[PDB]
């Protein structure tokens, strides 16, 4: 039942911008998300001091996916353990406690990809978090699907648009509610030529080119959040990427880089069937 939103697909209702994504299959400068628009959205909340830590996604009743750098990144002295964070699911407002809607869960164990490269280019920027107890699904809480080989091959194409969501900064200040922005996947050569950082096959970049007019990008706080696409084949949402890195936010000629979820699915499967 993954990727079918209770308030949209389940009732045969469309959100206001999903058509843009479908028409292409042939957070800075975003907008407020609709209620129940991204039911798999997860907020990584730091206990002390209480603050926004990162974004994440719900992939099952007990597993949450995020970016490895959200938990481990020596250059900025970041090394969070299980008890340092909390997971808030079903949220819309950024700062308020949404009583009777959001569900806060504690972390049982964190799993960072063994070959995550924090020293150079954040290669394999992915991590899993197992919750202590299952989260009950609702109209505002629902898991997103993970892509299979076919899904990735047909959807991960330059020009095809995905959707990025988060409570991160609005400029390179903070949003009142969850922000959303649709962005096109960019050709590998363009991604490479836009930066000095060494790009790998475990990442892809997205965002508009300067001559395309439109804009949008993730920014501080959006890290770990999902880059999703709605399959035109089975009408389910799939998480194709994880907000990983960029140079500045929404700069002309620059693009956001996302962890290629399918490329690391082997590792994800391994962790899930072995521990959870």
């Amino acid at each position: 039942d993954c990727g079918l939103r209770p308030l949209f697909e389940k009732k045969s209702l469309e959100d206001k911008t999903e058509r843009e994504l479908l028409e292409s299959y042939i957070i800075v400068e975003g907008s407020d998300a609709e209620i129940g628009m991204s039911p798999w959205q997860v907020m990584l909340f730091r206990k002390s001091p209480q603050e926004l830590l990162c974004g994440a996604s719900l992939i099952s009743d007990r597993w949450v996916l995020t970016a490895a750098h959200c938990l481990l990144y020596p250059p900025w002295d970041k090394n969070f353990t299980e008890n340092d964070l909390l997971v808030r699911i079903g949220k819309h407002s950024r700062t308020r406690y949404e009583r009777n809607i959001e569900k806060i869960s504690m972390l049982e164990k964190i799993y960072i990809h063994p070959r995550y490269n924090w020293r150079e280019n954040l290669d394999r920027d992915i991590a899993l978090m197992k919750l202590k107890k299952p989260v009950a699904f609702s109209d505002y809480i629902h898991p997103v699907c993970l892509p299979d080989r076919e899904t990735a091959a047909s959807l991960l194409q330059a020009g095809y648009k995905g959707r990025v969501t988060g409570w991160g900064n609005l400029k390179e200040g903070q949003p009142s509610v969850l922000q959303v922005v649709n962005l096109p996947i960019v050709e590998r050569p363009v991604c490479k030529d836009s930066t000095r950082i060494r790009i790998t096959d475990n990442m892809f970049c997205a965002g508009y080119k300067p001559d395309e007019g439109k804009r949008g990008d993730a920014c501080e706080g959006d890290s770990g959040g999902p880059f999703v696409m709605k399959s035109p084949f089975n009408n389910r949402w799939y998480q194709m990427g994880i907000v990983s890195w960029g140079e500045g936010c929404d700069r002309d000629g620059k693009y956001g880089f996302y962890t290629h979820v399918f490329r690391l699915k082997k590792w994800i499967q391994k962790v899930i069937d072995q521990f959870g």
Binding site: F45, Q50, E51, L52, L86, T95, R96, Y97, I104, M106
Partner: peptide, 11 residues
């Protein structure tokens, strides 16, 4: 500027 969350989760 985050609203206090229930103590049940913090503990």
């Amino acid at each position: 500027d985050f609203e206090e969350i229930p103590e049940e989760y913090l503990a």
